[PDB]
Every structure is written in structure tokens, then in C-alpha cells.
Design a binder for this molecule. Structure first.
Ligand SMILES: [Ca+2]
Length: 105
């Protein structure tokens, strides 16, 4: 299943979650994690795991892997999750997100 992992502009976590949901619905085999930088070094995270994915791949665990790296927190379910953190290293956050997904798919 395809994978979208990216850093994007968004005005709120609610918008970010809704964008993730629409991407997953428009291409239902896809799993998606978006990170959105915000002021003061904060970064928002929203993700969603495709319904067809391997059962060991859960959204909460994915978000936690990324947000814990960013000194933050995550919450959610096996299907959708969110979190926040702060970081100056978007490349590292993206790499954790992509490598985690590839290891669980
Ligand atoms: Ca499957």
C-alpha cells in the first residue's frame, strides 16, 4: 500500500486531521502521516493507517514514534492518531515516520 509522509502547512490540527482523512478516503490503500510546523518550534502530527494494512501497524504507535522523538506526546486509536512535539530537525522526524511505516507495512 502507498504511503504519504510529508511536512505541510496547516492552520490547525483539526485541518491537518481532516486533510489526512480525505487523502486516505480518496486513495483507500494509502497510509498517511503529515507533520505541520507551527510557531515557536512546535510541530503538529496527524496520521491514519489504511484499512488493508498489516495488523501490527497502528496509527497511535506511528504517531508516538514520531512525536516522542520530538519530545512530545501522541494519542489516538489503531486507525487514526495525532500528536505534537517541538523540533528543529524536520528531516529526522520525517525519516522516523517513513522508516517506522515501512517496517510495519
Ligand atoms: Ca492487506
Amino acid at each position: 500500500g502507498p504511503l504519504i509522509v510529508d511536512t505541510v502547512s496547516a492552520e490547525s490540527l483539526s485541518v491537518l486531521v481532516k486533510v489526512v482523512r480525505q487523502l486516505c478516503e480518496q486513495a483507500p490503500s494509502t497510509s498517511v502521516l503529515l507533520l505541520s510546523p507551527q510557531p515557536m518550534g512546535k510541530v503538529l502530527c496527524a496520521c491514519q493507517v489504511a484499512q488493508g494494512a498489516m495488523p501490527t501497524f497502528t496509527a497511535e504507535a506511528w504517531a508516538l514514534a514520531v512525536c516522542s522523538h520530538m519530545g512530545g506526546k501522541a494519542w489516538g486509536s489503531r486507525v487514526v492518531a495525532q500528536g505534537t512535539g517541538s523540533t528543529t530537525d524536520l528531516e529526522a522526524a520525517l525519516s522516523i515516520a517513513q522508516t517506522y511505516a515501512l517496517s510495519q507495512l
